[PDB]
């Protein structure tokens, strides 16, 4: 098929992010300056957003068999977006005091928003398996940034094993399902099936997808890469990592299974029952016992996409799966944001690769308390307390969970939870104790006041959540 | 052709075979040359000149190039780990590979069952790849390029030296 | 194909030209071999640079490989999309000369 | 058992092995021409003198080295580009391989021949040779990254891979005239893979490398002297049919004309080896990246946009 | 001619030798060699799965699947340089300062 010029109003966050990496190259190659390339791509950005507000002046279209562009897709393109904003407002300060170069961070931050932009454009196999390599790839370069810290090049290293291992896997279960059936497009894997839908190969197929992806989503047992590689990486890099790349791979993977008649299969769904069950358990009480902020937050990514995984369950029962997990992936986007905006903050600058990057939240309300305030709203939020917008993600998974009688995975979303708030506001009780032992930069007050804008939403959309619900259910896919 | 199929995947696997549990790394990179040659051998052999020409151009022409540069540049010749043979006993031996047989034995249980028309000629031209890699796959070839662009800058990053000289020794944390 | 009494002659020619070449450097070093009678460090990094410049654009280049057979049966939008491609080729090459990876300089 | 069919394939099997001895013979031809008309700036028997003494000498096995692919080496820097003329048209029916992918399988010998470099540098246990094998192992790399985009010129005028089909398109004009910067290019990185003069002991510039060609002895040498002249006469063989008229010509046989026009590009080898002197490598590397990939580049993007502007 | 099942055996075989390459070494240089076996196979199960339908999408899929070999490969071996200038040593098993 080819591209029409109305398509072309269709690809305009693409292709915007791919020309504003492009002359952020160029401005590297000319001048290498850090603010100068910093400006650039906050400004192509923003631009992104906007062009994304112009894409939602125009239709729902499907522009090559590669993508698809509706409201689902503009609702995670613009939470890419809005992650990667964030991403490189924490990551300024960070490298204000990185002695090394300072700018490849940025263009990896923006290859890695274009490879989420794609993942949620995506609605074909191999869209599928270039966004997710477009979001690994640059993830290599930024968790490993910081290559002379033993503990970045550790994670860099388990990272891009552990991820090119989980490549390969979902690349056979592609070839495996491409081989079964003839078409790689979502709608058609399969059509030629008709009591005849659990095919061994097929379902072999998606079992290694199921496994390429769950890896990504930190689902059990390809579980154990999330707390080594939050804790390494860059605190920016843990935020987006946590934020903008589980986002846009749970997207094109409820896309997968909601456009593929795979998804009635009596089989897969179970396995996602198990996986889901399991890594909500799992993921909790792995949590219980951690003092490092950044393995707790992993775990908590583990837990929390549990959640959204029973909520994946459900959704060709309960036809509000899509709109709860819009729900819940802004909610946990906006906490992840600010917890990590405050991680971010409270690490900045760099220091050096010999210095200790211990956040060490005890005693942080007595020397900057708006970033203990912001830190503990977004406790009470990841930990589904009410006023906050966690919780209202947390009512809509379960209310998605109890609507189709998924009662072993309700129980398991309530015994996790109950077992999450303990460390949850474990955390948010001792950043107010009494620490033994212990700024005024306009891009440090950018940081600040993006974490302060984040713990505003997160607050209002808790006691008000119905522009949320009102956008996010606005924004549906093609049925 | 099938005869030529049959011989070149079962060479593919001795071959894989011998670089899995070989000592020297440059003799395992010589078997997976050979082994890359005999999966181009398969690729002729079913019709996908494409795919064996960039297999030999690319996966056995840059990418064992690649790996071969770096042996030959660090100077490593799988010391200190030759020296133990861990990977020739029982205890490491046997688990993972009883593991990957499982693994082998359940998926080749999902292989067969399957309907099989089987594996006809009509040999895929590269014009067809180029007509269907330039149509439908515009946004494919992009942000492949994209990709390979984001991992020229990663490597880059990562592993440039910053000293001087084409001779440097192996100083702990580059002092 | 193994029917056409033509192409299966030339893939015999080819098999053979292939065997007896690699038999006659065979028997080259035979001959070299049976007559005439008896009697730590570190390379660098810009090797691997070099290497990696030229896998990357190697697989760049296949991309150019597969676009040359089909360039006058696409139409002016497969050329469009080269364009950008090879610009944005162009855009990363630059950027390796402009930065100093390209350079020697001993 | 005389059957037509069966007359058939082993006239084509002699025909192989015909055009094999003569490129053979032609490359040793070369070596003969390269000493003889350089010492001016039948004496054939020589040639024939030094392969006996080559022969006829007590080969080396380094104690500490290992065999196979010290041995595996000079094999690939033969062969490789050997094998790379199989896919050469000399006549309307005198070619060993017709396949599909023309150029594709030059490629790929093109790009196995830099394992005989990498294997004799781990092989021969020096540093020195290795480091030479790594700097030669780079240039060759460094200037065959343009070599596909360079003949994709060629494949984009002609619209396939296949040899047969270059050579009828190049029916009415010769491909030098529209593609000279493909033309020199292309030559300029034929030079460069086979490691000719020019860009020949990249360890001249540093005193901690030297020359991979040493530490073999005899016939092992002999090989990889031999294969770099099939090379460059296959690179030669290529360039004519690639650029030049594939045995075309006006009243003169098409083999006649393919080897008359083989030996003009020789005889303007020699003449570019006698002329030019060695650069260093500094600007070698940045020739060959900066001045060689654009250009090649904006040569496929001007040839594209001119057989699309004249599309009938 | 040739049946699609044994083609992805092949595939199946190679996938899973390369795993155990994978698993059982300890060298980070053989681990990423398992790793580029493991994506050749993939390739390969992809390659026979397009030519089973006669479709060019799996030589696409390939094509895909070569150039994120390409570049995962040089990522894995810069990581690998970089780990031997840092600790001198490419043990995979030395590098597990972060634990649970």
Not at chain 1, 233 to 262: E, N
Not at chain 1, 271 to 290: D, E, K, P, T
Not at chain 1, 318 to 323: A, C, Q, T, V
Not at chain 4, 267 to 281: D, G, Q, T, V
Request: glycine share 8%.
């Amino acid at each position: 098929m080819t591209i029409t010029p109305q398509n072309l109003i269709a690809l305009l966050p693409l292709l915007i992010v791919g020309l504003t990496v492009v002359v952020v190259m160029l401005s590297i190659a000319w001048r290498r300056n850090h603010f100068l390339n910093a400006t650039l791509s906050v400004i192509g950005l923003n631009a992104a957003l906007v062009s994304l507000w112009f894409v939602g002046q125009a239709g729902a279209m499907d522009v090559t068999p590669l993508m698809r562009v509706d409201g689902f897709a503009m609702l995670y393109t613009g939470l890419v977006l809005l992650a990667s904003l964030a991403t490189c407002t924490f990551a300024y300060p960070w490298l204000e005091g990185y002695n090394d170069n300072k700018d490849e961070f940025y263009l990896l931050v923006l290859i890695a928003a274009l490879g989420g932009i794609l993942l949620a454009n995506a609605n074909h196999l191999a869209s599928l398996f270039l966004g997710i390599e477009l979001i690994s790839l640059p993830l290599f370069g930024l968790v490993g940034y910081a290559f002379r810290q033993k503990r970045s090049l550790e994670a860099s290293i388990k990272y891009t094993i552990l991820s090119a291992a989980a490549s390969s896997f979902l690349l056979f279960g592609m070839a495996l399902v491409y081989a079964q059936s003839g078409d790689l497009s979502f709608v058609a894997l399969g059509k030629n099936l008709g009591g005849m839908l659990n095919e061994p190969l097929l379902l072999a197929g998606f079992g290694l997808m199921i496994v390429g992806l769950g890896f990504k989503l930190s689902l059990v047992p390809f579980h154990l890469w999330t707390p080594d590689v939050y804790q390494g990486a860059p605190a920016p890099v843990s935020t987006f990592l946590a934020t903008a790349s589980k986002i846009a791979i749970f997207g094109v993977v409820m896309r997968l299974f909601l456009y593929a008649p795979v998804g009635d299969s009596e089989a897969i769904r179970v396995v996602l029952a198990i996986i889901a069950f399991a890594s909500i358990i799992f993921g909790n009480l792995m949590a219980l016992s951690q003092t490092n902020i950044k393995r707790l937050l992993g775990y908590s990514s583990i837990s929390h996409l549990g959640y959204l995984l029973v909520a994946l369950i459900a959704l060709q029962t309960g036809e509000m799966s899509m709109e709860a997990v819009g729900v819940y992936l802004a909610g946990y986007l906006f906490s992840s944001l600010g917890a990590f905006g405050v991680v971010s903050l409270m690490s900045s600058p760099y220091r050096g690769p010999d210095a200790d990057s211990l956040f060490s939240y005890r005693g942080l309300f007595w020397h900057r308390p708006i970033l203990a305030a912001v830190m503990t709203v977004m406790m009470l939020s990841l930990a589904g307390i009410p006023m906050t917008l966690g919780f209202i993600g947390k009512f809509y998974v379960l209310a998605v969970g109890v609507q189709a009688h998924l009662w072993w995975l309700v129980g398991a979303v309530v015994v996790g939870s109950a077992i999450g708030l303990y460390y949850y506001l474990r955390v948010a009780v001792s950043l107010y104790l009494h620490a033994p032992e212990q700024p005024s930069n306009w891009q440090y007050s950018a940081g600040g006041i993006v974490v302060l804008i984040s713990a505003l939403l997160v607050l209002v959309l808790g006691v008000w959540p119905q522009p949320l619900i009102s956008i996010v259910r606005l924004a549906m896919p093609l049925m | 052709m099938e005869f030529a199929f049959y011989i070149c995947g079962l060479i593919a696997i001795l071959a894989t075979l011998r670089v899995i549990t070989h000592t020297n790394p440059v003799h395992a990179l010589l078997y997976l040359i050979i082994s890359l040659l005999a999966i181009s051998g398969v690729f002729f052999s079913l019709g996908a000149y494409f795919a064996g020409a960039l297999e030999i151009i690319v996966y056995a022409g840059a990418i064992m190039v690649l790996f071969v540069f770096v042996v030959m540049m660090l100077n490593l010749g799988g010391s200190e780990i030759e020296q133990e043979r861990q990977w020739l006993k029982p205890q490491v031996w046997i688990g993972p590979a009883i593991l990957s047989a499982i693994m082998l034995v359940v998926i080749v249980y999902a292989i067969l069952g399957v309907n099989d028309q089987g594996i006809d000629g009509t040999p895929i031209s590269a014009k067809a790849v180029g007509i269907t890699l330039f149509g439908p796959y515009v946004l494919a070839v992009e942000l492949a390029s994209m990709l390979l662009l984001a991992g020229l800058v990663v490597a880059f990053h990562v592993g440039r030296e910053e000293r001087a000289g084409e001779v440097l020794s192996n100083r702990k944390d580059d002092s | 194909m193994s029917t056409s009494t033509e192409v299966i002659a030339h893939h015999w020619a080819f098999a053979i030209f292939l065997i007896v070449a690699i038999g006659l450097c065979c028997l080259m070093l035979v001959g070299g071999w049976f007559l005439g009678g008896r009697a730590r460090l570190r390379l660098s990094a810009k090797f691997y640079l070099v290497a990696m410049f030229f896998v990357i654009f190697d697989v760049e280049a296949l991309y150019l490989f597969a676009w040359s057979t089909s360039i006058r049966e696409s139409g002016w939008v497969g050329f469009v999309e080269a364009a950008i491609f090879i610009f944005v080729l162009l855009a990363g090459l630059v950027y390796l000369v402009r930065i100093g990876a390209l350079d020697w300089t001993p | 058992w005389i059957s037509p069919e069966l007359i058939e394939i082993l006239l084509t099997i002699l025909k192989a092995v015909v055009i094999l001895l003569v490129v053979v013979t032609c490359g040793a031809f070369m070596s003969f021409g390269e000493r003889r008309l350089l010492g001016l700036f039948g004496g054939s028997l020589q040639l024939v003198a030094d392969m006996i003494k080559m022969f006829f000498k007590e080969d080396w096995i380094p104690k500490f080295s290992d065999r196979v692919i010290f041995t595996l080496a000079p094999m690939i820097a033969f062969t490789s580009l050997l094998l790379a003329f199989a896919i050469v048209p000399v006549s309307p029916g005198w070619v060993v391989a017709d396949l599909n992918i023309g150029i594709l399988f030059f490629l790929m010998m093109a790009g196995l021949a830099v394992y005989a470099v990498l294997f004799a540098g781990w092989s021969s246990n020096n540093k020195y040779s290795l480091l030479g094998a790594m700097r030669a192992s780079a240039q060759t790399l460094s200037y065959e990254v343009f070599l596909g985009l360079s003949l994709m010129g060629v494949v984009a005028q002609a619209g396939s891979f296949n040899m047969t089909d270059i050579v009828n398109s190049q029916a009415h004009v010769w491909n030098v005239i529209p593609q000279f910067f493909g033309f020199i290019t292309f030559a300029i990185a034929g030079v460069a893979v086979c490691h000719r003069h020019p860009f020949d002991q990249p360890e001249a510039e540093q005193e901690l490398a030297d020359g991979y060609h040493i530490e073999y002895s005899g016939m092992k040498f002999g090989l990889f002297f031999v294969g770099e002249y099939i090379g460059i006469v296959t690179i030669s063989a290529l360039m004519v049919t690639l650029f030049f008229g594939g045995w075309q010509g006006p009243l003169l046989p098409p083999f006649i004309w393919f080897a008359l026009k083989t030996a003009f590009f020789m005889m303007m080898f020699i003449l570019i080896r006698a002329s030019l002197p060695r650069p260093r490598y500094d600007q070698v590397m940045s020739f060959g990246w900066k001045i060689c990939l654009p250009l090649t580049l904006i040569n496929l993007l001007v040839t594209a946009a001119v057989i699309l502007w004249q599309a009938q | 001619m040739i049946p699609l099942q044994h083609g992805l055996i092949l595939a199946a075989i190679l996938f899973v030798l390369g795993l155990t390459g994978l698993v059982i070494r300890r060298n980070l240089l053989f681990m990423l060699i398992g790793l580029e076996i493991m994506i050749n196979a993939s390739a390969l199960a992809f390659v026979v799965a397009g030519s089973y339908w006669g479709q060019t999408d799996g030589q696409v899929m390939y094509i895909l699947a070569i150039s994120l070999a390409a570049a995962e490969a040089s990522i894995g071996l810069a990581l690998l340089l970089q780990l031997h200038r840092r600790r001198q040593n490419l043990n995979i098993d030395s590098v597990s300062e972060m634990r649970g």
